[PDB]
């Protein structure tokens, strides 16, 4: 919505409310946005929630530069019969919700796509 290039964003189409029937299913959806973010500028935090209304996820980078290119790549894709979107978070509120993920000194890596 607004010119707030923050180091964080949320997707809205990565799983469905009736499509989980293994345990461990976050690992792949997590791996996927790890690819995208890595190919741009890396990412130091991921949270795939599972009880979202519009498939929301929560991702955080070391630097707005990574966020810029990552969001720019992510929104406008097609999931399996949906449009991918992302939006940026309000940093001055996000930093209060994740008082710990602020310090995240460790770029994650994938396991398997």
N, CA and C of each residue as an Amber inpcrd file, in Angstrom:
protein
   339
   0.8090000  -1.2350000   0.0000000   0.0000000   0.0000000   0.0000000
   0.8410000   1.2830000   0.0000000   1.8850000   1.4350000   0.8280000
   2.5450000   2.7290000   1.0640000   4.0630000   2.6110000   0.8510000
   4.8050000   3.7190000   0.6350000   6.2440000   3.7020000   0.3590000
   7.0740000   3.4160000   1.6210000   6.9920000   2.1720000   2.0730000
   7.6030000   1.6090000   3.2670000   8.3640000   0.3880000   2.7760000
   9.5310000   0.6300000   2.1870000  10.4360000  -0.4310000   1.7840000
  11.0770000  -1.0020000   3.0460000  10.4120000  -1.9390000   3.7040000
  10.9020000  -2.5840000   4.9100000  11.6120000  -3.8910000   4.5300000
  12.3910000  -4.4490000   5.4560000  13.1440000  -5.6990000   5.2930000
  12.2500000  -6.9390000   5.5340000  10.9250000  -6.8370000   5.3890000
  10.0050000  -7.9220000   5.7380000   8.7640000  -7.8900000   4.8530000
   8.1870000  -9.0550000   4.5580000   6.9700000  -9.1610000   3.7620000
   6.1580000 -10.4000000   4.1330000   4.9160000 -10.4430000   3.6470000
   4.0100000 -11.5800000   3.7610000   3.4020000 -11.9440000   2.4080000
   3.5050000 -13.2190000   2.0130000   2.7870000 -13.8550000   0.8970000
   1.3340000 -14.1030000   1.2830000   0.5340000 -14.6080000   0.3330000
  -0.8740000 -14.9330000   0.5400000  -1.4190000 -16.0900000  -0.3200000
  -0.6120000 -17.1170000  -0.5980000  -0.9440000 -18.2190000  -1.5060000
   0.2530000 -19.1570000  -1.5930000   0.4010000 -20.0570000  -0.6240000
   1.4710000 -21.0630000  -0.5610000   1.0050000 -22.4410000  -0.0470000
  -0.2080000 -22.5490000   0.4920000  -0.8800000 -23.7590000   0.9390000
  -2.3760000 -23.4450000   0.9610000  -3.1960000 -24.4650000   1.1980000
  -4.6430000 -24.3680000   1.2450000  -5.1820000 -24.9290000   2.5590000
  -6.3990000 -24.5310000   2.9620000  -7.0070000 -24.9190000   4.2350000
  -7.4190000 -26.3930000   4.3270000  -7.3070000 -27.1580000   3.2400000
  -7.5880000 -28.5850000   3.1890000  -6.4870000 -29.3610000   2.4690000
  -5.2660000 -28.8380000   2.4470000  -4.1420000 -29.5130000   1.8140000
  -2.9440000 -29.4900000   2.7580000  -3.0760000 -30.2400000   3.8470000
  -1.9720000 -30.7730000   4.6170000  -2.4760000 -32.1150000   5.1440000
  -1.7720000 -33.2060000   4.8670000  -2.1060000 -34.5240000   5.3990000
  -0.8530000 -35.3920000   5.5770000   0.3250000 -34.7690000   5.5870000
   1.5470000 -35.2940000   6.1860000   1.8610000 -34.4560000   7.4250000
   2.8140000 -34.9000000   8.2350000   3.5150000 -34.0560000   9.1920000
   4.8130000 -33.6000000   8.5100000   5.3030000 -32.4020000   8.8330000
   6.5590000 -31.8520000   8.3270000   6.4140000 -30.9760000   7.0800000
   5.1980000 -30.7980000   6.5480000   4.9020000 -30.1260000   5.2720000
   5.3840000 -28.6740000   5.1650000   5.7490000 -28.0230000   6.2750000
   6.2830000 -26.6660000   6.2200000   7.6470000 -26.6450000   5.5480000
   8.3990000 -27.7460000   5.6150000   9.8060000 -27.7710000   5.2470000
  10.0050000 -27.3650000   3.7790000   9.1050000 -27.7670000   2.8800000
   9.1590000 -27.5630000   1.4340000   8.7680000 -26.1240000   1.0980000
   7.6190000 -25.6620000   1.6000000   7.0930000 -24.3120000   1.3760000
   8.1010000 -23.2720000   1.8820000   8.7590000 -23.5940000   2.9870000
   9.8620000 -22.8590000   3.5630000  11.0440000 -22.8550000   2.5940000
  11.4650000 -24.0260000   2.1080000  12.5840000 -24.2300000   1.1820000
  12.4100000 -23.3550000  -0.0510000  11.1780000 -23.2510000  -0.5320000
  10.8110000 -22.5680000  -1.7730000  11.1430000 -21.0790000  -1.7140000
  10.6200000 -20.3720000  -0.7160000  10.9110000 -18.9490000  -0.5460000
  12.3740000 -18.7570000  -0.1150000  13.0240000 -19.7700000   0.4730000
  14.4610000 -19.7170000   0.7080000  15.1770000 -19.6540000  -0.6510000
  14.7840000 -20.4390000  -1.6670000  15.3660000 -20.3540000  -3.0110000
  15.2790000 -18.9210000  -3.5180000  14.0510000 -18.3930000  -3.5640000
  13.7410000 -17.1160000  -4.1780000  14.6070000 -16.0530000  -3.5130000
  14.5050000 -15.9450000  -2.1890000  15.2520000 -14.9650000  -1.4360000
  16.7590000 -15.1420000  -1.6190000  17.2940000 -16.3680000  -1.6040000
  18.7240000 -16.6410000  -1.7840000  19.2100000 -16.0930000  -3.1140000
  18.4590000 -16.3660000  -4.1840000  18.7940000 -15.9420000  -5.5370000
  18.8490000 -14.4220000  -5.6590000  18.2410000 -13.6780000  -4.7310000
  18.2740000 -12.2270000  -4.6980000  19.3160000 -11.7050000  -3.7090000
  19.1180000 -11.9230000  -2.4070000  19.9080000 -11.2810000  -1.3580000
  19.8690000 -11.9730000   0.0040000  19.2350000 -13.1400000   0.1080000
  19.2160000 -13.9560000   1.3020000  18.0890000 -13.5620000   2.2500000
  17.9280000 -14.3660000   3.2950000  16.8420000 -14.2700000   4.2530000
  17.2950000 -14.9760000   5.5390000  16.9430000 -14.3950000   6.6850000
  17.4480000 -14.7680000   8.0100000  16.3020000 -15.2090000   8.9250000
  15.0830000 -15.3290000   8.3960000  13.9200000 -15.7380000   9.1680000
  12.7810000 -16.0780000   8.2210000  12.0880000 -17.1730000   8.5150000
  10.8710000 -17.5670000   7.8190000   9.8690000 -18.0960000   8.8430000
   8.5820000 -17.8340000   8.6320000   7.4830000 -18.3860000   9.4030000
   6.3130000 -18.6130000   8.4660000   6.1380000 -19.8780000   8.1160000
   4.9370000 -20.4040000   7.5130000   3.9930000 -20.7650000   8.6530000
   3.0380000 -19.8740000   8.9070000   1.7980000 -20.2340000   9.5800000
   0.9690000 -21.1020000   8.6530000  -0.0500000 -21.7370000   9.2160000
  -0.8400000 -22.7660000   8.6150000  -2.3330000 -22.5400000   8.8160000
  -2.7250000 -21.6140000   9.6870000  -4.1310000 -21.3140000   9.9690000
  -4.3440000 -19.8770000   9.5420000  -4.0520000 -19.6710000   8.2640000
  -4.3110000 -18.4320000   7.5600000  -5.5880000 -18.5580000   6.7240000
  -6.1780000 -17.4140000   6.3680000  -7.3860000 -17.2880000   5.5570000
  -7.0300000 -17.2240000   4.0730000  -5.9950000 -16.4570000   3.7340000
  -5.4430000 -16.3290000   2.3990000  -3.9880000 -16.7210000   2.4510000
  -3.6990000 -17.9510000   2.8730000  -2.4050000 -18.5610000   2.6650000
  -1.1970000 -17.7130000   3.1010000  -1.2900000 -16.9480000   4.1880000
  -0.2560000 -15.9720000   4.4990000   0.9730000 -16.6480000   5.0980000
   2.1370000 -16.0370000   4.8840000   3.4540000 -16.4630000   5.3550000
   4.1970000 -15.1980000   5.8080000   5.3020000 -15.2910000   6.5560000
   5.9740000 -14.1320000   7.1460000   7.4870000 -14.3260000   7.0200000
   8.1820000 -13.4480000   6.2940000   9.5740000 -13.6380000   5.8710000
  10.3480000 -12.3470000   6.1830000  11.6080000 -12.4490000   6.6430000
  12.4140000 -11.3020000   7.0660000  13.8640000 -11.4450000   6.6040000
  14.4190000 -10.3620000   6.0660000  15.7350000 -10.3140000   5.4430000
  16.6990000  -9.5200000   6.3240000  18.0170000  -9.6130000   6.0780000
  18.9780000  -8.7580000   6.7600000  18.8850000  -7.3050000   6.2840000
  18.3840000  -7.0550000   5.0700000  18.5610000  -5.7780000   4.3920000
  17.4330000  -5.5910000   3.4000000  16.7750000  -4.4350000   3.4410000
  15.6870000  -4.0500000   2.5380000  16.0190000  -4.3930000   1.0690000
  17.2830000  -4.3070000   0.6570000  17.7630000  -4.6720000  -0.6770000
  17.3410000  -6.0850000  -1.1040000  17.4260000  -7.0520000  -0.1880000
  17.0040000  -8.4220000  -0.4200000  15.4830000  -8.4750000  -0.5620000
  14.7690000  -7.8160000   0.3550000  13.3180000  -7.6770000   0.3540000
  12.8120000  -7.1320000  -0.9850000  13.3960000  -6.0390000  -1.4890000
  13.0190000  -5.3770000  -2.7370000  12.9400000  -6.4010000  -3.8650000
  14.0680000  -7.0380000  -4.1750000  14.1590000  -7.9680000  -5.2880000
  13.3240000  -9.2280000  -5.0370000  13.2620000  -9.7210000  -3.7940000
  12.4790000 -10.8990000  -3.4420000  10.9900000 -10.6620000  -3.6760000
  10.4130000  -9.6000000  -3.1090000   9.0030000  -9.2730000  -3.2930000
   8.7110000  -9.0550000  -4.7790000   9.5980000  -8.3390000  -5.4780000
   9.4750000  -8.0590000  -6.9000000   9.4460000  -9.3380000  -7.7340000
  10.1980000 -10.3720000  -7.3390000  10.1450000 -11.6680000  -7.9950000
   8.8800000 -12.4220000  -7.6040000   8.5090000 -12.4260000  -6.3240000
   7.4530000 -13.2870000  -5.7990000   6.0760000 -12.8610000  -6.3030000
   5.6450000 -11.6120000  -6.0770000   4.2980000 -11.2270000  -6.4990000
   4.1940000 -11.3130000  -8.0160000   3.0750000 -11.8740000  -8.4500000
   2.6790000 -11.9740000  -9.8390000   2.9110000 -13.3690000 -10.4260000
   3.5630000 -14.2850000  -9.6940000   3.6390000 -15.6950000 -10.0860000
   2.2530000 -16.3350000 -10.0780000   2.1620000 -17.5680000 -10.5710000
   0.9820000 -18.4030000 -10.4650000   1.3350000 -19.6580000  -9.6830000
   0.7450000 -19.7940000  -8.4970000   0.5970000 -21.0680000  -7.8070000
  -0.3480000 -21.9660000  -8.6210000  -0.5880000 -23.2040000  -8.1720000
  -1.4790000 -24.1640000  -8.8130000  -2.9260000 -23.6670000  -8.7460000
  -3.2690000 -22.8380000  -9.7210000  -4.5780000 -22.2460000  -9.8980000
  -4.8190000 -21.0590000  -8.9770000  -3.7770000 -20.3030000  -8.5920000
  -3.9120000 -19.0160000  -7.9010000  -2.8080000 -18.0850000  -8.3440000
  -3.0420000 -16.8050000  -8.1300000  -2.0550000 -15.7410000  -8.2840000
  -1.2690000 -15.5910000  -6.9780000   0.0600000 -15.5640000  -7.0540000
   0.9290000 -15.2120000  -5.9400000   0.8660000 -13.6990000  -5.7560000
   0.7790000 -13.2800000  -4.5040000   0.9940000 -11.9070000  -4.0930000
   1.8500000 -11.9170000  -2.8350000   2.5030000 -10.7860000  -2.5990000
   3.1430000 -10.4140000  -1.3540000   2.7790000  -8.9630000  -1.0010000
   2.9960000  -8.5630000   0.2540000   2.9380000  -7.1810000   0.7280000
   3.9730000  -6.9820000   1.8340000   4.4760000  -5.7590000   1.9890000
   5.4720000  -5.4050000   2.9970000   4.7980000  -5.1140000   4.3420000
   5.4870000  -5.4110000   5.4500000   4.9760000  -5.2010000   6.8090000
   5.2590000  -3.7530000   7.2800000   4.5850000  -3.2550000   8.3320000
   4.9740000  -2.0590000   9.0670000   6.1280000  -2.4050000  10.0220000
   7.3720000  -2.0740000   9.6590000   8.5700000  -2.3180000  10.4780000
   8.4200000  -1.8610000  11.9440000   8.0100000  -0.6130000  12.2540000
   7.8360000  -0.1150000  13.6310000   6.7750000  -0.8450000  14.4760000
   6.0440000  -1.7880000  13.8950000   5.1280000  -2.6740000  14.5910000
   5.7140000  -4.0970000  14.5540000   6.1930000  -4.5740000  13.3960000
   6.8270000  -5.8850000  13.2330000   7.9630000  -6.0830000  14.2400000
   8.8170000  -5.0710000  14.4440000   9.9460000  -5.1650000  15.3680000
   9.5000000  -5.4260000  16.8100000   8.2480000  -5.0980000  17.1460000
   7.6820000  -5.3080000  18.4660000   7.1000000  -6.7120000  18.6060000
   6.5730000  -7.2590000  17.5060000   6.0110000  -8.6040000  17.4760000
   7.1050000  -9.6490000  17.4440000   8.2180000  -9.3730000  16.7720000
   9.3520000 -10.2620000  16.6860000  10.5410000  -9.5440000  17.3330000
  10.5330000  -9.3820000  18.6740000  11.5950000  -8.6910000  19.3990000
  12.9100000  -9.4800000  19.3730000  12.8530000 -10.7240000  18.9060000
  13.9420000 -11.6890000  18.8740000  14.4540000 -11.8290000  17.4450000
  13.5690000 -11.9810000  16.4510000  13.9810000 -12.1480000  15.0640000
  14.6670000 -10.8900000  14.5020000  14.7040000  -9.7740000  15.2430000
  15.5170000  -8.6190000  14.8970000  17.0120000  -8.9500000  14.8650000
  17.5210000  -9.7600000  15.7940000  18.9580000  -9.9500000  15.9430000
  19.5220000 -10.9850000  14.9540000  18.6460000 -11.7300000  14.2650000
  18.9020000 -12.9430000  13.5010000  20.1350000 -12.8500000  12.6090000
  21.2630000 -13.3160000  13.1300000  22.5720000 -13.0890000  12.5280000
  22.9400000 -14.1920000  11.5260000  21.9820000 -15.0430000  11.1650000
  22.2270000 -16.3190000  10.5210000  21.2670000 -16.4910000   9.3460000
  21.8200000 -16.3680000   8.1430000  21.1620000 -16.6230000   6.8680000
  20.8420000 -18.1050000   6.8180000  19.5730000 -18.4540000   6.6150000
  19.1920000 -19.8580000   6.5010000  19.6710000 -20.4020000   5.1450000
  19.5670000 -21.7090000   4.9230000  19.8010000 -22.3680000   3.6380000
  18.7270000 -23.4450000   3.4440000  18.4980000 -23.9150000   2.2100000
  17.5450000 -24.9790000   1.9490000  18.1210000 -26.3460000   2.3200000
  17.2480000 -27.3420000   2.3690000  17.5520000 -28.7410000   2.5490000
  17.2820000 -29.5370000   1.2740000  16.1570000 -29.2800000   0.6040000
  15.6540000 -30.0470000  -0.5330000  14.4250000 -29.3280000  -1.0840000
  14.5030000 -29.0130000  -2.3720000  13.4190000 -28.6550000  -3.2800000
  13.3190000 -29.7300000  -4.3430000
